[PDB]
Amino acid sequence: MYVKLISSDGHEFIVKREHALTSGTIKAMLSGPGQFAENETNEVNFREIPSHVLSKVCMYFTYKVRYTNSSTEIPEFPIAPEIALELLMAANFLDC
Amino acid sequence: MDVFLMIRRHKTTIFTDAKESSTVFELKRIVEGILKRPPDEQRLYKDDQLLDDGKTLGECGFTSQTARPQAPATVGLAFRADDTFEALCIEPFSSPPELPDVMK
């Protein structure tokens, strides 16, 4: 149910598998034959996404899954100016 | 009513949610299913305040306004090795570069 995402600086992020499938890149990885055999560690290394960006991406995973089926009101996803460019590049790579 | 959390220890960060009315002990059961350590071997902190097993998450301070999906609240996690409990240790995330001047 849970998957481990590892940033370039070595931070390990354990998020729900269905949250991580919000990323089209991760969904392509794990929905087909790239799926972890159960002799394998459910780990994905992102050797070029730092942890302060990857943690922000996981917050977006939570936000997207929480508010996708809402029907009356959703809040804005906040993005600080300092991480906007790095987060934009991660969002481009992750297709989400 | 759900609260959204980052359970953090060393370089591990668990993203999970729980009810504002759920207890600290129930949260340790969630951590047990993930990191395979029973609640007796766990300590949970809000900042530096250790949380008691029987208290609810709302009574500890985790509410909908402070533990949102797009901005989860942080819960510190300390394991116990054999005799005694480790010190609560959480390594911060990396820091972004200084803001480009063309971004004011």
């Binding site: 990885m29 087909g32 790239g34 055999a37 297709d95 | -």
Partner: protein
């Protein structure tokens, strides 16, 4: 070099490589070579036909690339085909295939020329596009089958078959014997 430990690992790495702005064909070929073929990890895709080779789709690659396994009976071979201006990687999983490269035909109707000719050993990964030329692959073994792993980016269902008598083309749309391990008639 990142040596893929399993076939699933190689597929996960490939999805990351083609997620980037810039895909390096030398890196893809080397990582595909580094995977040591394990029949226990791809046998479900090895579906054979008595009279023709089979194309078995494995992964649709998020629309960026195609991954398929081709299975060659004794003496089975391809036509002379182009690749619709897409990269094409070919790794051997079992047996051997003889790749014969051809130059694009002149507009006068005469015999196409063989620029070179080689036999791909197992676990070797070849690369081709339209810029290096046309090719044709064959299982020259009289006794052994051949199984190959193909990566095409961008994915293409159409290409051109070439008569070696003439050089004259004719368009072909390529079928699948199976998809994701399921027979598709």
């Amino acid at each position: 070099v990142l040596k893929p430990r399993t076939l699933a690992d190689l597929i996960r790495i490939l999805h990351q490589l083609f997620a980037g702005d810039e895909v390096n064909v030398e890196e893809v070929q080397a990582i595909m070579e580094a995977y040591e073929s394990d029949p226990t990890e791809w046998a479900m895709y090895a579906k054979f036909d008595q009279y023709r080779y089979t194309r078995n789709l494995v992964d649709q690659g998020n629309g960026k690339f195609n991954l398929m396994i081709l299975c060659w009976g004794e003496g089975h071979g391809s036509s002379i085909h182009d690749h619709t201006n897409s990269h094409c990687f070919l790794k051997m999983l079992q047996g051997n295939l003889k790749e014969t490269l051809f130059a694009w035909p002149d507009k006068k109707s005469n015999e196409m020329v063989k620029k070179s000719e080689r036999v791909l050993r197992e676990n070797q990964c070849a690369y081709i596009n339209d810029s290096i030329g046309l090719h044709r692959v064959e299982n020259i073994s009289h006794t052994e089958p051949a199984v190959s792993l193909h990566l095409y980016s961008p994915p293409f269902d159409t290409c051109h078959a070439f008569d070696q008598r003439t050089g004259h083309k004719n368009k072909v749309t390529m079928t699948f014997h199976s998809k994701f391990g399921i027979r598709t008639p």
